Symmetry: C2
Subunit: 192 residues, 2 copies
């Protein structure tokens, strides 16, 4: 059971202060574990951080709701948006770790974060590439940059929440309408 | 001169570890200043952090390159992209502070970060609103959510750089082409 309480405490301290702001003394104190339990049995600060980040990014190795729509690029893009919104609703901590690693990487960035993000961007880009070949999508746009644009739309909506509280709804009630809006912008733009 | 060296040291330590990961002892040690100089003359950890964040967000109070294009929504959107890219090229530290505050806010979030971001989003939304009234833009999309989408495109391109190194160019040589691509997606979508 002190394994579970350590995972909780590690997630909340590393989420707050990042890997570079947390000490093993703080982890032990917050969990009521000894520095020795932590170092010898739970992999130290580093082992706990790796375990926490692996849990944060676990869902990125499970892309079948998106991959399963291949053959219909619009359905792929829609599934990607729905999946991404779900991820954020289920895990309020994720953008803390995701942005902290992208802007102040640890050794876990190359091991866990970078391949997770790249796998998703690739998947989207492949679908865009297929749509371009088919003539559904315009051939003067670059598939990866286009994928990054879609990913940016949805991820910035959640990232900017605290600064935009009175400017738009962030209620989960409106998530399906957000998907409708971002699918429309990405595929058809804002032009009349 | 120890004022200048303190600002440098504060920017680099707060950029790395965030406000919540930096101690006044670390600041003094890194700058070769006493804890007393810092507390009594430079406003302590908090004063230094406020000064650093104010410098990080200073350019957000200077939006005339964007505002000056009002009357032509496309020119506003283009100017916004160009300005945002410039900001990131001139200040590699900015997304560290920007994401850290949005995900782990300090008292400086409400004072500095939130109004800076809101002022830009408002400006974009107003231009989109005008274009909708004029019939240039579709009336079934929400202006603020659309503004957030454009902001998300460009900000995610820089945010995701470390994870996408081999997937697309991030060379400043290609910044004008990026603007061309993101203007095209936002206004016309990816459809043929
Ligand atoms: Cl496909
Ligand atoms: Cl306008």
């Amino acid at each position: 059971d002190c394994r579970s309480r350590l995972m909780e405490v590690a997630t909340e301290l590393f989420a707050q202060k990042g890997f570079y702001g947390v000490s093993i003394r703080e982890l032990a104190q917050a969990a009521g574990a000894s520095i020795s339990m932590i170092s010898y049995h739970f992999g130290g600060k580093e082992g706990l951080y790796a375990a926490v980040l692996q849990e944060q990014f676990a869902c990125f190795g499970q892309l079948d709701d998106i991959r399963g729509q291949a053959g219909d690029p619009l359905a792929v893009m829609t599934a990607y948006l729905r999946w991404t919104i779900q991820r954020h609703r289920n895990n309020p901590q994720l953008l803390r770790f995701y942005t902290s690693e992208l802007t102040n990487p640890t050794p876990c960035f190359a091991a866990i974060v970078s391949p997770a993000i790249a796998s998703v961007i690739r998947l989207l880009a492949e679908s865009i590439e297929a749509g371009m070949t088919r003539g559904l999508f315009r051939r003067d746009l670059h598939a990866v940059n286009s994928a990054l644009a879609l990913a940016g739309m949805v991820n910035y909506f959640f990232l900017s929440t605290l600064a935009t509280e009175g400017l738009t709804s962030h209620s989960p009630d409106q998530d399906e309408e957000l998907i409708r809006q971002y699918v429309a912008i990405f595929t058809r733009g804002i032009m009349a």
